[PDB]
Amino acid sequence: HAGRTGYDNREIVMKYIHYKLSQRGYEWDAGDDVEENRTEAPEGTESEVVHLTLRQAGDDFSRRYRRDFAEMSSQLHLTPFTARGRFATVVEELFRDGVNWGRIVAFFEFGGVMCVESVNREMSPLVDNIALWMTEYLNRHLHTWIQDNGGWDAFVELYGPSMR
Numbered sequence: 001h002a003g004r005t006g007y008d009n010r011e012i013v014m015k016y017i018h019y020k021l022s023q024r025g026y027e028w029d030a031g032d033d034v035e036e037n038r039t040e041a042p043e044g045t046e047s048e049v050v051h052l053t054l055r056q057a058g059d060d061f062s063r064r065y066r067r068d069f070a071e072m073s074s075q076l077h078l079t080p081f082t083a084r085g086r087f088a089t090v091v092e093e094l095f096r097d098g099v100n101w102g103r104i105v106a107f108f109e110f111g112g113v114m115c116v117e118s119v120n121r122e123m124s125p126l127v128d129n130i131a132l133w134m135t136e137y138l139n140r141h142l143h144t145w146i147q148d149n150g151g152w153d154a155f156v157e158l159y160g161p162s163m164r
């Protein structure tokens, strides 16, 4: 009794972040389990529509705010110990009062911003860790907000591309 797409907070973040790194050409060792996993074929026209919307959603945002999160990035600093604690401290501010499709878009960007921050130095593997925490906060907050507010289909339906 919950759609038939199987959207996974982990997968969505893994794809979005995976694309961000692709732009640079970094073969992010995401699917460490590279043993040919079919299960039910890669075909996912269902979650495919939102994959583009969500993927493009962040891009359009980053282009609008090119002097907000970029600066705060310097505050994050560079370290594996504080990195994990800094993430939660940042997201916490993303939604002080309440959550909304409008604010969540910034959520994805954050991960990508902090993710690349590690790659810039020499902590590519860390990119995987970030995604782990991202899904936690997204599933522990957003998920509940989206699930109660229609769901994923809402975002894509509300913010749908031209025609299709």
Ligand SMILES: O=C(NS(=O)(=O)c1ccc(NCCSc2ccccc2)c([N+](=O)[O-])c1)c1ccc(-c2ccc3sc(CCc4ccccc4)nc3c2)cc1
Residues within 6 Å of the ligand: 056, 057, 058, 059, 060, 061, 064, 068, 069, 090, 091, 093, 094, 101, 102, 103, 104, 105, 106, 107, 109, 110, 111, 113, 159
């Ligand atoms: O305007 C906003 N939302 S909206 O009006 O409801 C909207 C407007 C357009 C679209 N879509 C249009 C097509 S693409 C697009 C998507 C989103 C926004 C703009 C365009 C969408 N949406 O798709 O959900 C939502 C909006 C504006 C500003 C912020 C915002 C501002 C300062 C900060 S600081 C921070 C720390 C986390 C943090 C750290 C690092 C980086 C980011 C955030 N996060 C912030 C987030 C957050 C949301």
